[PDB]
Write a protein that binds this ligand. Sequence first.
Ligand SMILES: [Mg+2]
Ligand SMILES: [Mg+2]
Ligand SMILES: [Mg+2]
Ligand SMILES: [Mg+2]
Ligand SMILES: [Mg+2]
Ligand SMILES: [Mg+2]
Ligand SMILES: [Mg+2]
Ligand SMILES: [Mg+2]
Ligand SMILES: [Zn+2]
Lengths: 177, 142, 57, 206, 36
Amino acid sequence: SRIGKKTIVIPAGVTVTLNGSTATVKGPKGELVKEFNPEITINIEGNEINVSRPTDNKNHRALHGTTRAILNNMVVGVSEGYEKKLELIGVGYRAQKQGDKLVLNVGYSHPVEFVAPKGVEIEVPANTQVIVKGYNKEHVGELAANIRAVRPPEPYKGKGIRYEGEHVRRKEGKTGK
Amino acid sequence: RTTYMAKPGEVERKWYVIDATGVSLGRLSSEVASILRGKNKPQFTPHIDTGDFVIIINAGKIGLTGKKATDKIYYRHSQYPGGLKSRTAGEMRTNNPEKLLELSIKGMLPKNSLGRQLFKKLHVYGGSEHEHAAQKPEVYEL
Amino acid sequence: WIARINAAARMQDLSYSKLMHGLKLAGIDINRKMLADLAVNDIASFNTLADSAKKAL
Amino acid sequence: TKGILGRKVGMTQVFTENGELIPVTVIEAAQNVVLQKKTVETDGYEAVQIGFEDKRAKLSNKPEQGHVAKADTTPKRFIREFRDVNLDEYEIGAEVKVDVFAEGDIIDATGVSKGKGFQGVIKRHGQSRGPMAHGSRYHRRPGSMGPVAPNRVFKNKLLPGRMGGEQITIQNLEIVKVDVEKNVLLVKGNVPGAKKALVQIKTATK
Amino acid sequence: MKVRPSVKPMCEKCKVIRRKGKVMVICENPKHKQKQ
RNA sequence: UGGCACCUCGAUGUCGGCUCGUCGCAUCCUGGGGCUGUAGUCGGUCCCAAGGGUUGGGCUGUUCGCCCAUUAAAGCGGCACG
RNA sequence: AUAAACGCUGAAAGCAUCUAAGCGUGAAGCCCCCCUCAAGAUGAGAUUUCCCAUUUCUUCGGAAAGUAAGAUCCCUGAAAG
Ligand SMILES: [Mg+2]
Ligand SMILES: [Mg+2]
Ligand SMILES: [Mg+2]
Ligand SMILES: [Mg+2]
Ligand SMILES: [Mg+2]
Ligand SMILES: [Mg+2]
Ligand SMILES: [Mg+2]
Ligand SMILES: [Mg+2]
Ligand SMILES: [Zn+2]
C-alpha cells in the first residue's frame, strides 16, 4: 500500500488521540471519533502519524490503505472542512430557505423540504444554486446526494438538479425523419 | 455377574457456570451436552441420570462463523395449512439468545424420557448475571 | 466398560486409545471388565496402572 | 384515553340539529369506582381497575369484601381493567362518570355477542347450499372434506358447532349525547350483546 | 439491464467488474449494461 | 402424445358438473425497479414480488372453443385428470 | 429491517471503482401496529383479598375425623342451552 505508507502531517490547532483502536480528532471546526480494527496499528508523535502493516496478504493491505485514507480525510475535514455544490436547471426551478430549512420548487405540486443534521449546513447563494458544507466527507456527500436524488437530470432537456462536475448524456426527442 | 450400576440419587450432582463469549455454538453445545449426560464420570449408567447442572451466561455473545448470521434458518410449523415460519440465526442472537442455545443443545441430547429430563437441568442467560447464587455454582473451563 | 474407562482416564490426562496402547506396550493383560470395575471401586490402583501405561509410551 | 363500563338498555333514534335521523344505542353507566392501580414496579404493566355495579351483601363473600374495603365501597358485580390510560388521574375510591366523554367523541365498544346454539355450516360460516331439485340429495351439507393424498383432513375445515357468545369489538363509533343526571350515554349504531349486557366504552385506538 | 448467462463486452468502452459476487458489465451506453 | 408391464382381477367406481378447498410460481391485476426505436399520452421488454383479488350469460353431456355484455384483471398448473 | 435497484465514503491497484472494512435511500412482500384464542406454556407464570395452625391414633414415615374460608346436592328459571 503506497497510500498506507504515506505520512500524515498534523496541522496546527488540531489534536489527535488514541484510545485503543478508537481515534479522536479535534480542531477549529469540530470533533470526530472513529473505530478501526486492532490488527492495524498507529504511531503518535508531535506532528506525524504513521499506520503500519504487520502482514502482506490481501485484506490486510486493503485495510492499511483505507485506514490511512480515513485518517487523512478526518484530519483535513477537522482542519479546513468540506463542501459540495449543486445547480438547478429548468424553468420555474427555484431554491430557497426559511431559517434552517431548504425549500425546493422543482416542478411538483408541493415543495420539497430539507433539514440538515448536526455538523452540516446548507447555503443558498442564489435561487438556482445550493451549497452543502461540513467537516465530514461522508455526511456532506450523503446529503448532497439526497438533495440531488429529488430531481436528477434528464437526457432530453438537461432539466433537474446536478453537480457542476457532471456531464449529462444528452438524447434527441425526435429522430429518424 | 458383577458390574456396577448406579442408583437414583446416589451420585452427587454439581452446579457449573460456563461463559459463552466468543465460542462457536456447536463446540460449546457438544461439551455442555456431554456434561449434562454424565459421560465425564466413571459412574455413568445409561438408564440413570448421573450428570450435572449447567448455567450459561453471556449467551448473546456466542460466535457464528461464515455467513451463518444471515444465512442459517430455523423453521416452525403450526400444523395448519401453509403455517411455516422462518427465522434467521443472527436476529435470534440479538433477540432470543436463550432460545438459540436451547435449540442447539436440545438437538444433541437423546430423544426419550431421560433426554427431556436432562433438558431441564440447563439454564441460559443472555447477560452476565444469573439467579442461582443459592446453589453455589462453580466455574468450569471448556 | 469402554465408556467408563474413558471417563476415568481423562482425569489422568489421557485418552482411552492412548491408555490401551500404552497398556499393550507394557505387557499388561487386564481386560475391560476388570479395568472398569477397578475404576469405579478402587481408583488408586487404576491410577497406578495409568502411570505404568504412561511410562510405557 | 378514557374508559367506562355500562349496561346496554336498548335501541332507539334521535333527530339531529339539521333534521337528520340516526339510530342510537343507550348505555347506562352508574356506580363506577376506581378499585386498584397496577404499576410496573409491582405488576409489570400499568392499568386501572374499575368496578361497575352495586350488589347485595348476600351475593358476595369475604374475599370480595376485603378487596373492595381498600377503596371504601360496596361489592361490585363487574370488574375490568383498562390499559393505555394515565395513572396520574384515578385516585383510589374515586367515582367515574359519563362526563369523561363529550358529544362528538369516537370510541371502541367491547361486548359479548348474542348466543346461538348448535348451528350448521351455512348459517355458522355462510356456506352455499346445494340444489333443491333436479334429483339432488344434497342441501345443507358441509362439502368435501379434502383431497385423497394426505390420508387425513386438514385443520380449519369448517364444521357445525356452537355459534354465538364471543367477545366482539366495534371500532370508531360516535357519541351523540351525554346525560349526566341520568348517567346515560347515546352511541350511534349498535353494539354486541343482548339487553342488560355489559359493555366497555373506551377511546378509539386509531 | 440485460440478465444473461453470457455477459461479455459489446463495444470498446465496456468494462467487466464484479460486485457482490456477480460478474457484470458497465458502460457509457446504457444499452450495454449486463448482469450475470 | 408415447414406451415398459413393477402393485392391485377372493373388485384400487370410470367423463363432465355441484359443494369445499389447499398448495407451486414459469405473475393475469395491483406494488417496486433497469433498458427502450423512453419528448408527452399510450406502450414494449426484463428483474424483485405468491399479500389479497381474479364475471354473468347463448350453443353443445361436453373439457375445450366460438359468440354477447362487462371488469383493475377475467393466470397457468399439482393434489388417485383433488 | 430488507429484495430488485440507486448512491456516499474507500482501498486492494498513488488513478478509478456502490464493496473488500464502513454508511444511506429503497416494495401490496417480512417482523410489528389492528382483531380473537391462549399457563396441561408438566417451562403449569403474576397481582389483590379471605381462612388458619384443631382432635385422635401411629414406631418416624404417616393414617382418619370433625370443621374454617369456600363450594355443591336439591329446588324457581333465561339474557344460556
Ligand atoms: Mg437447524
Ligand atoms: Mg340463545
Ligand atoms: Mg340451543
Ligand atoms: Mg329432498
Ligand atoms: Mg384377489
Ligand atoms: Mg348456455
Ligand atoms: Mg375495464
Ligand atoms: Mg390436477
Ligand atoms: Zn459499451
